[PDB]
Amino acid sequence: AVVSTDEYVARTNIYYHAGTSRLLAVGHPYFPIKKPNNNKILVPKVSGLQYRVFRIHLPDPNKFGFPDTSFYNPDTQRLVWACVGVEVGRGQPLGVGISGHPLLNKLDDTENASAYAANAGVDNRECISMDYKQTQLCLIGCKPPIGEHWGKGSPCTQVAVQPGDCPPLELINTVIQDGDMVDTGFGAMDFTTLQANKSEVPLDICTSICKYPDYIKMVSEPYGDSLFFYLRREQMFVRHLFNRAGTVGENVPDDLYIKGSGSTANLASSNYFPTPSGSMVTSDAQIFNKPYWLQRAQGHNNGICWGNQLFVTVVDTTRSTNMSLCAAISTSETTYKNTNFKEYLRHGEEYDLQFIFQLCKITLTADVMTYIHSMNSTILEDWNEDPLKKYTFWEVNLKEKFSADLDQFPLGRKFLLQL
Amino acid sequence: AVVSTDEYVARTNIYYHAGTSRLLAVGHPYFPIKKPNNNKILVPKVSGLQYRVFRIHLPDPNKFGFPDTSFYNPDTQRLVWACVGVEVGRGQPLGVGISGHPLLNKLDDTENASAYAANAGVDNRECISMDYKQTQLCLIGCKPPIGEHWGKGSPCTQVAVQPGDCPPLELINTVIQDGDMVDTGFGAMDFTTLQANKSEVPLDICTSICKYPDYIKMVSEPYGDSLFFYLRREQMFVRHLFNRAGTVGENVPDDLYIKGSGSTANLASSNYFPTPSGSMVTSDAQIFNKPYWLQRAQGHNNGICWGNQLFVTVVDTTRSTNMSLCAAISTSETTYKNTNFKEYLRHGEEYDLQFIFQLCKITLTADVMTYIHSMNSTILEDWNEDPLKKYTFWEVNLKEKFSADLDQFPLGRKFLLQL
Amino acid sequence: AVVSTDEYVARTNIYYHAGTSRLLAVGHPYFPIKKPNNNKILVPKVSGLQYRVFRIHLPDPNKFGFPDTSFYNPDTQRLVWACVGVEVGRGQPLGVGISGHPLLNKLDDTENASAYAANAGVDNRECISMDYKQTQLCLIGCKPPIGEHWGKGSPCTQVAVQPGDCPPLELINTVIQDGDMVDTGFGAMDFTTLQANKSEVPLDICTSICKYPDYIKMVSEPYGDSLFFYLRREQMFVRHLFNRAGTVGENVPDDLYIKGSGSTANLASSNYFPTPSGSMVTSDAQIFNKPYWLQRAQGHNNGICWGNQLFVTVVDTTRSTNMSLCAAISTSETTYKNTNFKEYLRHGEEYDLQFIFQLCKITLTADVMTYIHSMNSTILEDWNEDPLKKYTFWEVNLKEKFSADLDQFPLGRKFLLQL
Amino acid sequence: AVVSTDEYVARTNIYYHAGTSRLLAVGHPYFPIKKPNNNKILVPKVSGLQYRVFRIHLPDPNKFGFPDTSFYNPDTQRLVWACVGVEVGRGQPLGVGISGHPLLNKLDDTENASAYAANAGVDNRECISMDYKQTQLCLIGCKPPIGEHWGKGSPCTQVAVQPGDCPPLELINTVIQDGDMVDTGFGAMDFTTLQANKSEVPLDICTSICKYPDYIKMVSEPYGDSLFFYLRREQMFVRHLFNRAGTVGENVPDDLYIKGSGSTANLASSNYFPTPSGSMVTSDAQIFNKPYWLQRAQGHNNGICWGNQLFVTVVDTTRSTNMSLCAAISTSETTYKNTNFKEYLRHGEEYDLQFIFQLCKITLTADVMTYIHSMNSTILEDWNEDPLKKYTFWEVNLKEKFSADLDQFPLGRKFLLQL
């Protein structure tokens, strides 16, 4: 049996404030800039379609330098930090960003014809681009966020295929790491393995995984340690409608229509896909830059930063606008000249994490002691290998950032005017 | 230690009104009109994408001609002006402006093609226009506002570039003076130095710096002197999808795709870039011609016009509509003739500022005298060079404008029915 | 010193209903149809882009036939109407009206191009049309409404131009007379003088003035006699993007770009201009057909129809639909022939005004008599030339319309159930 | 003088329920299907642009078999039915209908030209379609609803026209009978007579009359018999812009422009017209399927079903989707063949009318018997020729449908939970 941390946790009236003065990221919107031969990234991918998963490091209270230590008993009760205030500061102008591919598998427009189209010269791919689904979302937990996407989940043992017989899909749950790819409107899934074509979706994603947060499974989580706060805001629509060029993988059944004549007697690809478009971004609808008061929570854990760890997962499209820049090869020329300028694409991203933490304690009884055990062994052990080694989050160290006086910060100032 | 001025500043029951009878601006919407030889601006840039930073001059209350002087003590305490009411009125019909470049670096349309693009001669630039993202904001403080953009921040000492190797971006904070360019859809930056192309963006901006207000930074400001009241309203989307022409700055790695054949076997600019769109302007969203009540403020300064200075920063695109006028060369002709009429662009801005000020007093004690010194030295010293010498704002002189009886003014009359 | 009329004016509990049974206007949407040689207008211009400025005439209460006269004293106090209730009724189905010019100065579409535009011969004017900005507004006052628009305000005495040297803009206030042109999309100004071209804007305006109510200036009225009640609801956006043909007025300075080659060696007109669009008209947003209660009013006057005059300025585009009708030349033909029908365009307009007046009185003391003198002389005089002789408003005579029982009208019936 | 029926009518505590189990209509969306020689409509026009005027027949109460008769006195007081509840239920999916004409008088697109259009030979007509304005309305009276629309109201005696000289419009009121055309975005009028042309507007209208409820008249109605409950919900917009082919009815005055040269020297039809568009229909806007409670009404009558008559007028575009169906000529062919299938277009409409009526009595006094008489003579008379003989309404007999116990009906169940 599980129960509200509000049971076994005690809350004190000691509040601290904490926040990275201003994070920054700058890169290239689709792919990483590395050496021609070497594999070192002299510039990294940085788009507004990557989930920024921050890992907040919190000082052990159990050792923190408190100006007083009467509020608690070092012998029976140990201290836990607790979150109540989070505000995910974004500091970039709202705009939209565009992604694309030089060789997009796109046959012909299907939105509206005027004549059954022509024969694909073999290879018909073309250069087209779009504006991905708008997705604004933030997740807070003391455990990493868990997404989902499709993929190929090695077969049923029988007919080990004739190269081609389409992939076994299989829902795959996974840890959302900083850097992963949001849904963009083409589903969530593994492009690198579902699409051998290597060119059915813009440059940034065709080589990646498009992950979507398994709310359902996270909320279904017992201890409710995954996320306790979270707010999503996603919206997209059909902009164009297109046809996948390529061979027929499965044939349209001959009972669904009737044969043609010459032109109409050879069927055009009946595999259509549409490009998405996250409509107009609006200020009146920002999730960020807005304070989230975590006083209560439908889940059992309620802001108990077990492990002194905090996981903030943000995904923000509204300020995706990647800028281009070009530089000249020589200042001589008096006349524009196509091969006299080099063109580049970059994208910035300005973050500003804000936090308000509540000091707590927990006297360790028998049933206490066993629960904290039966829940997370480490908590007791730690209390005085890393399962998160295999993962990569944006690491944040807030240990020398805590401050008691919220009278000196924007986020306390407000938190103080609420409670 | 900082603390709401509500602490060390006393509030009287004294309220004065003041506002510019009518400000007006008229210019050319992309670039200034000067002598061909001389560089004196006969007509100046006047667009709806310019921050209109207004600098309000208040008479020194410690000197102002008051029809009573009992309420305070000229010996121990000193009068400071406080603001509580502000209405940024706006005097022109709503509408949109459009901007453009006669040689915009656009290669082909990428939104949808029908066969692989034909190669590029040299200078495929064309004449293109758009309607920038609708931005509507107003920022009030005692200090000028502080914007941010991207810029080339002198490198890392090593490989001093082969002309071309892309610039070092670096977020640069700055004073947002009257007249700078608003974000327009194309992110916040200095175009003059990231774009040597001299033509990646409309005529008004390619030679300019697009500056977005670093709220994060001014709200995290301690004393909170930058802004204490501010409302933003932005919205934009992708109108079109274009390719930047010119040379491959960085190559697409050969694992994100597959080669092709003849036509497809030569990849066309994989540098997309979209034009923005500031959708329908609706009156039902106006931020101006509405009164702003500065009774409270999350920032510790609350109305204290330290120095008797006030800084109102406005961005108003809803009224960007720029009108063309043409004059004939001669009224003789009876039949239209393209070269019988000169064609001109103009833009107008009607402004009206409104204020309500509450007179305050501060009795100078030890810890007062010290705070007011530790904050802003000048206060004490002014109290009886210009750090804003290097900037330009719309100098406003209200000294001879204050008026006790609100009973005579629409802002007053509103304010008096509020309190 | 000015003061709310609630001061010097006395409110009785006598209430009257008054309102034209049903007005009607029918004309041609773009221009007046007059004699080929004579200049008398056999049909007039009637479109949903002209300010309907009604001039309500009210019976002198000081002479009106009241069934009793004991509620006031005919020697010291004088009667005056007040307004509390107005309902601007519209009775045509909602729709939109299209306007256009068969030789609109339009070069080429700048929205997105495919290759640098081919020079212009001479006269590349073309026939285009559009759906102006949707503007719903209603204004109410004792005086006439006051607009604003730009025009040429005779120069600075120096270089009296080389025909061509663009016009001096100048904001120009004026009396919105019934019939003037509202804002349509192309801002507020005098097309007949700013544009010698005589074909930069639809056929209904290119010869007219487009006027916008100087709110700001009327609000800032001390006596608040202009308007006291008023509501606006305007919206527009850019449907297309065009290039103005004609001669370069002012040249793009050569530091804004870089020369080109052949095609791109010679710059295409850089004076873009957009066609507006009042999008979808929705019932759910009607200003009219809605009763407006005038119980209060930020302006000092409050319903005091001084002189017994009421001005109701209305603008309604939502019922702009102009229908076309075509007569035959003969019912002979059994085949459709282009030159066998004549095509005409007409537009209808159904108004229905509604008011509720509250009888009043003012005892004429010293400071009363003086104030009513220093405000508006005539009041005391009339009380027992026309300044608005030089204007034209839809004249309405409501003298034989007043009724005391509101138990018999819809406006009333509602009024009754309000108070 | 008139007065609320709540005066002279007496309201008992008797309530009944009543409603057609399920109306239904099925026909052709534009025009009627008849015999080639004969004129009998083997299938009728059933679109959703036809006001569906219902006529509700209620049983005389003064005769109805009631399970008690103590509540009134068969001698002095007489019984009238009264409505309080109504719910026009709608049983067909939301959708849109599209309307068109194979020869519509469209010259050329004016939205955006690229060069002066080419002259028109004869008969430029082409085949266009659209999606009329979205109208949602429902009107309830004891009298039938009174429309409006423009017509030719025979001239002024002077110059009995030269065939062509355009028609005299005149607004003509009239009874809205079942089957009539709604407004469809081309205004309210009679196309049969204003448009000799016989193809300026989609097939289903061109030969009818579009009539729009004269609310202003009906509501100004003294007895308020017309309607007493009503709710309207229209929205439309300009989808494209066209030119009306045909001869100049009336000339552009030569002062609104300037002569051209060759192409531009000969003006294109200045008669533009737009096609409309009932934008997306949304669930969340349903006037229907929702119950209307008539407990009050601004109108004197208040649900007194004088004559036991009830006039429900409904207009529902939102479920306008007309389905096309095609049967082969022969199951032989193994190849699609144009002339081997006949194509037809049918439209369904599922109504369900719901009511709740309240049993009344009125004691026959003097002033009662007089009023009753100076309003509607019949009332008294009937009380124990058809003026609506000449009209056509969907007849609905609920005489054998009345039921006391609302405990057994959805509309009751609801009315019951309100009162």
PDB file of N, CA and C in Angstrom, chain C residues 122 162 229 316 369 383 386:
ATOM      1  N   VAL C 122       4.580  50.296 -70.660  1.00  0.00           N
ATOM      2  CA  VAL C 122       4.056  51.483 -69.973  1.00  0.00           C
ATOM      3  C   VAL C 122       2.635  51.244 -69.520  1.00  0.00           C
ATOM      4  N   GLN C 162      10.152  70.282 -57.644  1.00  0.00           N
ATOM      5  CA  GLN C 162      10.283  69.913 -59.040  1.00  0.00           C
ATOM      6  C   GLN C 162       9.087  68.915 -58.954  1.00  0.00           C
ATOM      7  N   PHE C 229     -20.744  58.198 -25.320  1.00  0.00           N
ATOM      8  CA  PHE C 229     -20.719  56.812 -25.512  1.00  0.00           C
ATOM      9  C   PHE C 229     -20.172  56.439 -26.877  1.00  0.00           C
ATOM     10  N   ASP C 316     -20.861  50.360 -40.519  1.00  0.00           N
ATOM     11  CA  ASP C 316     -21.145  48.973 -40.481  1.00  0.00           C
ATOM     12  C   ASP C 316     -20.781  48.304 -41.749  1.00  0.00           C
ATOM     13  N   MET C 369     -25.814  79.728 -14.555  1.00  0.00           N
ATOM     14  CA  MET C 369     -25.968  80.663 -15.730  1.00  0.00           C
ATOM     15  C   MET C 369     -24.678  81.090 -16.473  1.00  0.00           C
ATOM     16  N   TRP C 383     -32.731  78.876 -25.405  1.00  0.00           N
ATOM     17  CA  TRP C 383     -33.596  78.816 -24.279  1.00  0.00           C
ATOM     18  C   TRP C 383     -34.536  80.069 -24.225  1.00  0.00           C
ATOM     19  N   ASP C 386     -26.692  78.807 -38.095  1.00  0.00           N
ATOM     20  CA  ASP C 386     -26.387  77.340 -37.746  1.00  0.00           C
ATOM     21  C   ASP C 386     -24.919  77.013 -38.080  1.00  0.00           C
TER      22      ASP C 386
END
